[PDB]
A paper describes a structure:
E. coli aspartate aminotransferase (AAT) is a pyridoxal phosphate (PLP)-dependent enzyme that catalyses the reversible transamination of l-aspartate with α-ketoglutarate, yielding oxaloacetate and l-glutamate. Using our approach, we enrich the less populated but catalytically active closed conformation in order to increase catalytic efficiency (kcat/KM) with the non-native substrate l-phenylalanine, leading to altered substrate selectivity. Steady-state kinetics reveal kcat/KM increases of up to 100-fold towards this aromatic amino acid, resulting in a selectivity switch of up to 1900-fold, and structural analyses by room-temperature X-ray crystallography and multitemperature nuclear magnetic resonance (NMR) spectroscopy confirm that the conformational landscape is remodeled to favor the target state.
To obtain structures in the absence of maleate, we applied a rigorous crystal soaking method to serially dilute and extract the inhibitor from the crystallized enzymes. Chain B however remained closed upon maleate removal, likely due to crystal packing interactions hindering domain rotation of this subunit. These results are consistent with a previous study that showed that only one subunit of a homologous AAT closed upon soaking of the crystal in a substrate solution. Overlay of AAT structures (Chain A) in the presence and absence of maleate show transition from open to closed states upon inhibitor binding for WT, VFCS, and AIFS, but not for HEX, VFIT, and VFIY, which already adopt the closed conformation in the absence of bound inhibitor. Furthermore, DynDom analyses of all variants confirmed that only WT, VFCS, and AIFS undergo hinge motion upon maleate binding, which rotates the moving domain relative to the fixed domain by 4.6, 2.6, and 5.9 degrees, respectively.
Residue numbers in the entry:
A (entry chain A), B (entry chain B): -2 to 396
Write the structure that this text describes.
């Protein structure tokens, strides 16, 4: 008989991860990796947060069983997640209009929403920004959903092309899903202003879109509450929406897969009905979520002492990134750059388009050991005082 | 605009988890839970294994980062998993014919395999035993695969109907997937004999099936090596096969979601080619797997001192279940059951069909607070010397 795997086509190379393999292979000393997708501290390390170590020691001393969690995970983890997203006194919580499922990471939350929508609604189309996180298309496609793109990035002024965004979403029908990055847009770091959020919220209601928010970087732009203003503007006007949030970055719990899918409906009776089908899609996927990572988050957010520690560690991460953004611009200037890189200061989060062509990105990698994604995206959190000067010297040399 | 979630139908109750929710709510003090497949010790607790607590202490004091694992997880975890499945000096291992991905539990391993098959091959049908774990149909249906049933259990004699098995499977065409329980068949507890396994291994290669092994209870029938004989018979004869395994139960790591999906192809080139697509299906699902549980398992299996403790803890779990099976049969006769329950002694694992009708199972729950699955499956590992007498008095009362 002929094998079942005989004529399987090899999968293409992942953009972000395909670079990590080429970097680890590079035997040259001093190589710099700006294609990473995680945070690094002043010494180039991705440490475990102090609040997390404390929480983990408490769990080691007090856990008496590893018995299964419910399909939707730790209840306290859900309550605290909804407070972070909507605010302590949100009407969505008091009206019992939101239900939250603990998921393996923000990716798991997007996949659960995709499976839920594909199997239980007439949704057939998801609209994603161009550019966006490359994995968005894979997740919704995995459920058989068509993914269309809407305009976003003005590569001339390094700003949000709001006029083209509206025009490109003209063909988005009622009942279509429109995906928004809550804050720190990946990869451009360009976020709508509060006024622009409100315009989109109003337009979303008139057009009949189902908004889906991807919230992976709460606390990395301006602050916890500030970074949720855009979502809460939608929450105030919409009867229904979906939020896929992640704690991978703002708790440094990347490999513990800590995320949440939050479902909002018109009333308590409708969200409970819908949520039962979301739990069914989780049951047929991974059954129930991993406990350790979410227990840490729940312990920290429910303990005032630990939460004060965590919030300061998040501030330390946010402030270091802004300093590197400023130091990056000043050092490029110091090293003789004629191109204006001021837009870097105006962008939020770990990522920004350097504006380098693929040809310049290629020269950095093979000629200077500086590794960036082919799109020109660079992780500002991968920059340190020790590597800033070599990095900038390389960039200037290819401009 | 009408809502997208307005016309969603509530999901039905899970045959296993819907029962567990009822048990937690029951206020009667003498209630007994024989439903969910979770181990209980002599005191009715589900403790953390001592080896696990020690491994978790090591991790707490030596982990320096939570950085993402690779899509396929911890390497040593994958290596140790293949040794348990195939043996120390397996030809599959030395020939580099096997690839293993760490997955969120055994369920996650099933969904990953299903997603991988539905999107990269011509597989349309999956053959699952009748009866089987209820979630099997849900996992493969959600990936878009049709599920056909083949005969297995002889309800009159309480044994394996090996004739009806071979007959119903003659309708399975080449390229179809046939799911086998590696050991401790859920829910019957009847496993094929080594002679019957070898008969199925030979019939499989002839008809061109794609074997899929669900291995959730390795070490609970007779032993680690002994429980892999059936699989290792297929492995020494097949060019391709898939093994979804779980560490939820033999490590008591339920809520940390520790499993593996192992892919076997004809040669190292085909397996790496197919595995690249499996890693793609994982990326579009949960991205990468949770570390804590798998790290514990790898720490234990790689340290001879810890492993020695774990192997003894697993032996005690296996033996206690066997003692409860004997005690269960002896006590039923003591309490006046008359019917012969000797077949329970010949069944392996946690689960056994009590032979009770759905109506008797219903009476046990409403009238006596004894909670079993509607199929009559009872968890022997939930029986203790303290709850054996009330449990058996209730069963005799409904006979
Ligand atoms: C036969 C079978 N397959 C798969 C599973 C799922 O195991 P896990 O909890 O690790 O997802 C179980 C759990 O009971 C099982 O009995
Ligand atoms: C990182 C990221 C995710 C996924 O986060 P995980 O918790 O690692 O799964 C989703 N969306 C965006 C925009 C991200 O940057």
């Amino acid at each position: 008989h002929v094998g079942t795997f005989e004529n399987i086509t090899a999968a293409p190379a992942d953009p972000i991860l395909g670079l990590a393999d080429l970097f680890r292979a590079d035997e040259r000393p001093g190589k710099i990796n700006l294609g990473i997708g995680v945070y690094k501290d002043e010494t180039g390390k991705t440490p475990v947060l102090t609040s997390v170590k404390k929480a983990e020691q408490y769990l080691l001393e007090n856990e008496t069983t590893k018995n299964y969690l419910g399909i939707d995970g730790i209840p306290e983890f859900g309550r605290c997640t909804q407070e972070l997203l909507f605010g302590k006194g949100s009407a969505l919580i008091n009206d019992k209009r939101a239900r939250t499922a603990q998921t393996p990471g923000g990716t798991g939350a997007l996949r659960v929403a995709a499976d839920f929508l594909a199997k239980n609604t007439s949704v057939k189309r998801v609209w994603v920004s161009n550019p966006s996180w490359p994995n968005h298309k894979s997740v919704f496609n995995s459920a058989g959903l068509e993914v269309r793109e809407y305009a976003y990035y003005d590569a001339e002024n390094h700003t949000l092309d709001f006029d083209a965004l509206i025009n490109s979403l003209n063909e988005a029908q009622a009942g279509d899903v429109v995906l928004f990055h809550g804050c720190c847009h990946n990869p451009t770091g360009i976020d709508p202003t509060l006024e622009q959020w409100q315009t989109l919220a109003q337009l979303s209601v008139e057009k009949g879109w189902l908004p889906l928010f991807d919230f992976a970087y709460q606390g990395f732009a301006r602050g916890l509450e500030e970074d949720a203003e855009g979502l809460r503007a939608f929450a105030a006007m919409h009867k229904e929406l979906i939020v896929a949030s992640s704690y991978s970055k703002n708790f440094g719990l990347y490999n513990e897969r800590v995320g949440a899918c939050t479902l909002v409906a018109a009333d308590s009776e409708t969200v409970d009905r819908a949520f039962s089908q979301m739990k069914a899609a989780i049951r047929a996927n991974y059954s129930n979520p991993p406990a350790h990572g979410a227990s840490v988050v729940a312990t920290i957010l429910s303990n005032d002492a630990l939460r004060a520690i965590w919030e300061q560690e998040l501030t330390d991460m946010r402030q270091r990134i802004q300093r590197m953004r400023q130091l990056f611009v000043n050092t490029l200037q110091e090293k003789g750059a004629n191109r204006d890189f001021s837009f870097i200061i105006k962008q939020n989060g770990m990522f920004s388009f350097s504006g380098l062509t693929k040809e310049q990105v290629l020269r950095l990698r093979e000629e200077f050991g500086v590794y960036a994604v082919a799109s020109g995206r660079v992780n500002v959190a991968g920059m340190t005082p020790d590597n800033m000067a070599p990095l900038c010297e390389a960039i200037v040399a290819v401009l």
